[PDB]
Design a protein around this ligand. Structure first.
Ligand SMILES: [Mg+2]
Ligand SMILES: [Mg+2]
Ligand SMILES: [Mg+2]
Ligand SMILES: [Mg+2]
Ligand SMILES: [Mg+2]
Ligand SMILES: [Mg+2]
Ligand SMILES: [Mg+2]
Ligand SMILES: [Mg+2]
Ligand SMILES: [Mg+2]
Ligand SMILES: [Mg+2]
Ligand SMILES: [Mg+2]
Ligand SMILES: [Mg+2]
Ligand SMILES: [Mg+2]
Ligand SMILES: [Mg+2]
Ligand SMILES: [Mg+2]
Ligand SMILES: [Mg+2]
Ligand SMILES: [Mg+2]
Ligand SMILES: [Mg+2]
Ligand SMILES: [Mg+2]
Ligand SMILES: [Mg+2]
Ligand SMILES: [Mg+2]
Ligand SMILES: [Mg+2]
Ligand SMILES: [Mg+2]
Ligand SMILES: [Mg+2]
Ligand SMILES: [Mg+2]
Ligand SMILES: [Mg+2]
Ligand SMILES: [Mg+2]
Ligand SMILES: [Mg+2]
Ligand SMILES: [Mg+2]
Ligand SMILES: [Mg+2]
Ligand SMILES: [Mg+2]
Ligand SMILES: [Mg+2]
Ligand SMILES: [Mg+2]
Ligand SMILES: [Mg+2]
Ligand SMILES: [Mg+2]
Ligand SMILES: [Mg+2]
Ligand SMILES: [Mg+2]
Ligand SMILES: [Mg+2]
Ligand SMILES: [Mg+2]
Ligand SMILES: [Mg+2]
Ligand SMILES: [Mg+2]
Ligand SMILES: [Mg+2]
Ligand SMILES: [Mg+2]
Ligand SMILES: [Mg+2]
Ligand SMILES: [Mg+2]
Ligand SMILES: [Mg+2]
Ligand SMILES: [Mg+2]
Ligand SMILES: [Mg+2]
Ligand SMILES: [Mg+2]
Ligand SMILES: [Mg+2]
Ligand SMILES: [Mg+2]
Ligand SMILES: [Mg+2]
Lengths: 186, 123, 114, 56, 118
RNA sequence: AGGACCGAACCGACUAAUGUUGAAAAAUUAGCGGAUGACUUGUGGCUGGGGGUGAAAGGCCAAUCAAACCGGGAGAUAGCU
RNA sequence: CACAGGUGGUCAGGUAGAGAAUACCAAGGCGCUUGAGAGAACUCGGGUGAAGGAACUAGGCAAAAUGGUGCCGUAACUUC
RNA sequence: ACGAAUGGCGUAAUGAUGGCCAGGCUGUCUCCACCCGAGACUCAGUGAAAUU
RNA sequence: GUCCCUAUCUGCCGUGGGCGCUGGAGAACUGAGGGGGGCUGCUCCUAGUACGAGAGGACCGGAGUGGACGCAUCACUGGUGUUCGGGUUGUCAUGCCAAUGGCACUGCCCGGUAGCUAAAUGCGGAAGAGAUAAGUGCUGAAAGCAUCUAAGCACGAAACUUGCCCCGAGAUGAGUUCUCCCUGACCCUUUAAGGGUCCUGAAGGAACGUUGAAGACGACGACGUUGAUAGGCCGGGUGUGUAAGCGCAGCGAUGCGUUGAGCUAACCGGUACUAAUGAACCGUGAGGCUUAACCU
């Protein structure tokens, strides 16, 4: 199934009436607008390209402006593709919003994790032949990379305020982009 | 959060006063035992006229910890000291007849209903 | 941001009494055995208060059975049914962590007589 | 640890291939004084964006 | 990592930083324009402008805060008697940072920082 | 009173770290030992190399010591490289 | 070497202090002849630390800890 | 098996002496975390070395 | 041989610059390939069932919760928090009192914001599919039978390829899609993918500036007045814990009132007050040949 692009708003808790505190990451999933539909004939695979949010009209480059103008949609803050299952089809310009998750129990959330910079082996790898083999665990850049966390419980889908509350932590800092896909493991 | 070498008070009247955790049971390379976990101990101090004697090696279940226990709403219960209740080596049942000080709801399991029953308080 | 605040605002209790560190409070907490649900009272000295909106918490210290017990309650948790201030304490610190080294005569707290 | 072989003038030049300085892309021209200056820096005569900001 | 942290260390320990910015705030108040390195000017905004805001409301307690800060009665008097009223209506941004090239001795990026109404 | 005690100056140099193309051809830092004595220190003097001196370690005798340094025999000798 | 070393004597302010310790100051003298940024790993010197408390290790190395005065009190052994 | 002034056996006190144990204490460690400084990194100036 | 190493080379871990990829540019992809991951205990139903004279006790399958490990995060619980508040010793100073500041390891402490973070709390290991190993087989002659094999067919394990996650078109085999921009003139000669002048300078990029949960530096991201990019400012929150001054009580230390006061970093919500300048710079001017096909 397709996913949606959201913004990490931050973490909070939900108190259940039987007194459980559920740590939730609040994802602001505002309407995702289909900017392009890809099919086997023209593209070799089936996907939709969505955008979201809004963009500075004077900071939309003219290629980007033309690409959005073909779709008849307003320029968003990025473009993301979602692969399509055969039963699924969408139309260019159509808007997709968070109640797509209204019946989804678990999701996968992928974002760019926080950047730890140049991290040593202790932080990065939990350290304590005549050559070094490839993949040797060494110090280097940590974080600031695509990370997916799988099978997060969906605590609440609030369509009116464009919210998705997933149980637990999701990668990245507040205000970073998140791709939320219905859980693929399931 | 008990590990090997940790000294624990005894919450029962089995005769031992202080025990030292000598191995944390329940998994390979398991580091810590929290409230409700089984540990092999050795007796360090006991009353002269008690049912267990200094140097005895037997199991125990941790009932109070300074590290505390967390509740599903996020709350946490902390005690001033680490306390255990002696269990038999094979039956794994309490050896004393009373429990001193409170224990927690985390022992409310079929294995440890004795301690809940004997507890002055079950927080 | 605003969104987090509104989400928290839809969960904070409205009837939270005002208490300060050093007060003696009785916290009624919802305790569930099996299927029977009942109130257990926890009475002790407020030694720390964390005011963070929905994430507010306070620590209550009592000496039960000669054992010092600290229980940190989540103020807006539904498991906390009621908070009642049994005695107004007269301290000067926001956190009374020094009470952990105090026993008997040393742990008395002056009444806040007003 | 130290080399076994004198590195060549070729390798020295290759290493220094990234040592070249980058000239200033272009200077700005103050609208009032007409003096050139680094963009966002005051001119030598104390002008910035057509304003005499420092006297003398 | 220094995520979301603020305040430049400036290769000084805390006491030296505090003393240097006390001195530099005094110099800025008494001269109303000083030439310093760009990072020091940027950190100096955060030290001087709060002084001016404090000086906006004239009271004994405020003057004693402005003296505990800056430790100078010359400077406190100038703040509360001139800069307070000069900036009484202006909501922030009392200083202006003008980049002015590079220090000859060490190629440091220099900047003029001045009160905006000088 | 004391080759008494604790402890600065002062004398030393037990441990660890640093340094180890050093700040330094032996130190620095933190600790450490003695600290009225068989103590320590200034100035001057004496003892000279198979010799001196040595609470003795083959220690020290000018950053050199199981025999100083310098000049000479001397271009020793080297079946070795 | 404009070298974190060595180098005898003399003088000896204030407050606290037993003190020539030590802290802060006086008189007086200095900021140590590369700076400016940044705020990675890592190294060095430090501060703090949950729960545990030597489980580390060759070894409690290092660190942490003890630390003052007055009053009480003080073991085996002893050449008293 | 050492062994009686190449001294034998004891011995209070003393020891920066060897070995062991206990209490206390702890980042020594479980297992590291964060922070403060000095380097490392960038800029300007000066500018080595071993080795080849 | 061991250990070091101011690390030139190899290797490795990260991260850039160049040029390429055939007009240039902005994006979004595909996926060749590569990497990661793959662990386990217990409890509970099947089931006290089959088995066993009893004692004892399943296979298979199903369901939760732990450990170790890994990934992420900071809502919680905490640590830190020399940038916040307070207490306090000695001293010096601000003329003095009062109030403050300096120094003494942050003087010593007590708390603690943001951030970072583990001990904190979420998540993961799989299912499934394809081809198999040992082995189990079906059919079937050689060899009138028998035979798992010769022809053929079915199974068959954490092994293999997938499936999950990440990197990934310098994948030079340099791929695809969408979008955007440029539609002048002339001269010369060894007349060609030639050189040159003039006019032109796009899309975009870069640079500069304000910066960032990004970062060694590069890089990457946001923003640059048509602006919330940073600082300040306003309000809040948070932390600390009732400032100063004044008044009263007291002989005084001090207490009480004003007063949950004052102050409050990195937080939240706002706010153009300060700084993000008009420009300039790079990048061009329709993009080779051959051959096929098609519109005409
Ligand atoms: Mg970062
Ligand atoms: Mg060689
Ligand atoms: Mg270079
Ligand atoms: Mg910031
Ligand atoms: Mg510097
Ligand atoms: Mg200081
Ligand atoms: Mg003596
Ligand atoms: Mg000596
Ligand atoms: Mg070291
Ligand atoms: Mg010393
Ligand atoms: Mg002595
Ligand atoms: Mg002494
Ligand atoms: Mg000898
Ligand atoms: Mg010598
Ligand atoms: Mg000789
Ligand atoms: Mg001869
Ligand atoms: Mg010769
Ligand atoms: Mg010098
Ligand atoms: Mg010298
Ligand atoms: Mg001397
Ligand atoms: Mg002194
Ligand atoms: Mg640092
Ligand atoms: Mg260190
Ligand atoms: Mg410490
Ligand atoms: Mg600790
Ligand atoms: Mg502790
Ligand atoms: Mg202990
Ligand atoms: Mg050991
Ligand atoms: Mg031992
Ligand atoms: Mg070991
Ligand atoms: Mg030691
Ligand atoms: Mg110490
Ligand atoms: Mg003898
Ligand atoms: Mg270790
Ligand atoms: Mg340089
Ligand atoms: Mg040379
Ligand atoms: Mg080795
Ligand atoms: Mg190295
Ligand atoms: Mg693999
Ligand atoms: Mg937070
Ligand atoms: Mg805390
Ligand atoms: Mg602190
Ligand atoms: Mg302070
Ligand atoms: Mg005073
Ligand atoms: Mg001073
Ligand atoms: Mg001083
Ligand atoms: Mg399978
Ligand atoms: Mg047959
Ligand atoms: Mg596999
Ligand atoms: Mg702003
Ligand atoms: Mg508050
Ligand atoms: Mg004050």
């Amino acid at each position: 199934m397709i996913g949606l692009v959201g913004k990490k708003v931050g973490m909070t808790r939900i108190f259940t009436e039987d007194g459980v505190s559920i740590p939730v990451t609040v994802i602001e999933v505002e309407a995702n607008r289909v900017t392009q539909v890809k099919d086997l004939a023209n593209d070799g695979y089936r996907a939709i390209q969505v955008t979201t949010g809004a963009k500075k009209a004077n900071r939309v480059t003219k290629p980007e402006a033309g690409h959005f103008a073909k779709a008849g949609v307003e320029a968003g803050r990025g473009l993301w593709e979602f692969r399509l299952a055969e039963g699924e089809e969408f139309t260019v310009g159509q808007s997709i919003s968070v109640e797509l998750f209204a019946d989804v129990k678990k999701v996968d959330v992928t974002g760019t994790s926080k950047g730890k910079g140049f991290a040593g082996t202790v932080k990065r790898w939990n350290f304590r032949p005549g050559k070094v083999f490839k993949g040797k665990k060494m110090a280097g850049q940590m974080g600031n990379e695509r990370v997916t966390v799988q099978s997060l419980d969906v605590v609440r889908v609030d369509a009116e305020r464009n919210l998705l509350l997933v149980k637990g932590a999701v990668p990245g800092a507040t205000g970073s982009d998140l791709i939320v896909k219905p859980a693929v493991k399931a | 959060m008990i590990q090997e070498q940790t000294m624990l008070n005894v919450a029962d009247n089995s005769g031992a006063r202080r025990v030292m955790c000598i191995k944390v049971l329940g998994g390979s390379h398991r580091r810590y035992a929290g409230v409700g976990d089984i540990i092999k101990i050795t007796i360090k101090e006991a009353i002269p006229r008690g049912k267990v004697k200094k140097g005895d090696v037997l199991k125990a279940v941790v009932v109070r910890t300074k590290k505390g226990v967390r509740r599903p709403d996020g709350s946490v219960i902390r005690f001033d000291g680490n306390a255990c209740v002696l269990l038999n080596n094979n039956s794994e049942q309490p050896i004393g007849t009373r429990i001193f000080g409170p224990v927690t709801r985390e022992l409310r399991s079929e294995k440890f209903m004795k301690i809940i029953s004997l507890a002055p308080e079950v927080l | 941001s605003n969104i987090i605040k509104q989400l928290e605002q839809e969960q904070m209790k409205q009837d939270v009494p005002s208490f300060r560190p050093g007060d003696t409070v009785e916290v009624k907490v919802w305790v569930v055995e099996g299927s029977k649900k009942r109130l257990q009272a926890f009475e002790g000295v407020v030694i720390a208060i964390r005011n963070r909106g929905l994430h507010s918490a306070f620590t209550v210290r009592k000496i039960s059975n000669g054992e010092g017990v600290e229980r940190v309650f989540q103020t807006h948790s539904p498991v906390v049914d009621s908070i009642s201030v049994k005695r107004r304490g007269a301290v000067r610190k926001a956190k009374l962590y020094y009470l952990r080294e105090r026993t008997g005569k040393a742990a008395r707290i002056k009444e806040r007589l007003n | 640890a130290v080399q076994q072989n004198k590195p060549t003038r070729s390798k020295r030049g290759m290493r220094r291939s990234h040592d070249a300085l980058t000239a200033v892309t272009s200077l700005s021209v103050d609208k009032t004084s007409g003096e050139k200056h680094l963009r966002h820096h005051i001119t030598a005569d104390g002008y910035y964006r057509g304003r005499k900001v420092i006297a003398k | 990592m220094r995520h979301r942290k603020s305040g430049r260390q400036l290769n000084r320990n805390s006491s030296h930083r505090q003393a240097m910015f006390r001195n530099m705030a005094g110099s800025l108040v008494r001269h109303e324009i000083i030439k310093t390195t760009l990072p020091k000017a940027k950190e100096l905004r955060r030290v001087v402008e709060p002084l001016i805001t404090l000086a906006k409301t004239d009271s004994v307690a405020n003057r004693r805060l402005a003296f505990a800060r800056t430790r100078d009665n010359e400077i406190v008097a100038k703040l509360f008697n001139e800069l307070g009223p000069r900036f009484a209506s202006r909501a922030g941004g009392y200083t202006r940072i003008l980049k002015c090239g590079f220090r000859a001795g060490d190629n440091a990026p220099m900047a003029y920082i001045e009160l905006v109404d000088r």
